[PDB]
């Protein structure tokens, strides 16, 4: 979607693994504020949005 109508999708109630994301997209920038990605594979969250 375009910026002025960004799209939001709720993802919950599932086992999330953030190790598969390295695949898709050369990923010019992948950075986090408040967590560090190598440790991101461990914690449990409230409600993650995309």
């Amino acid at each position: 979607a375009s910026v002025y109508a960004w799209n939001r999708k709720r993802i919950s109630n599932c086992v999330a693994d953030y190790s598969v994301l390295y695949n898709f997209a050369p990923f010019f920038a992948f950075k986090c504020y408040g967590v560090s990605p190598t440790k991101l594979n461990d914690l449990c969250f409230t409600n993650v949005y995309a």
């Binding site: 408040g34 967590v35 560090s36 190598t38 440790k39 461990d42 914690l43």
Partner: protein, 49 residues
Amino acid sequence: SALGKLQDVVNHNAQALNTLVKQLSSKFGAISSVLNDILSRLDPPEAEV
């Protein structure tokens, strides 16, 4: 309140320790107050500061 002085000594000390324990909850600017999360959700380079 005939024994005001002795009772007051006890309360001053108890209150000092109590506030010292309560002050552990303050964050002082860190992203969280308990050490476990900081060491859990962050890499060592940022966890230092």
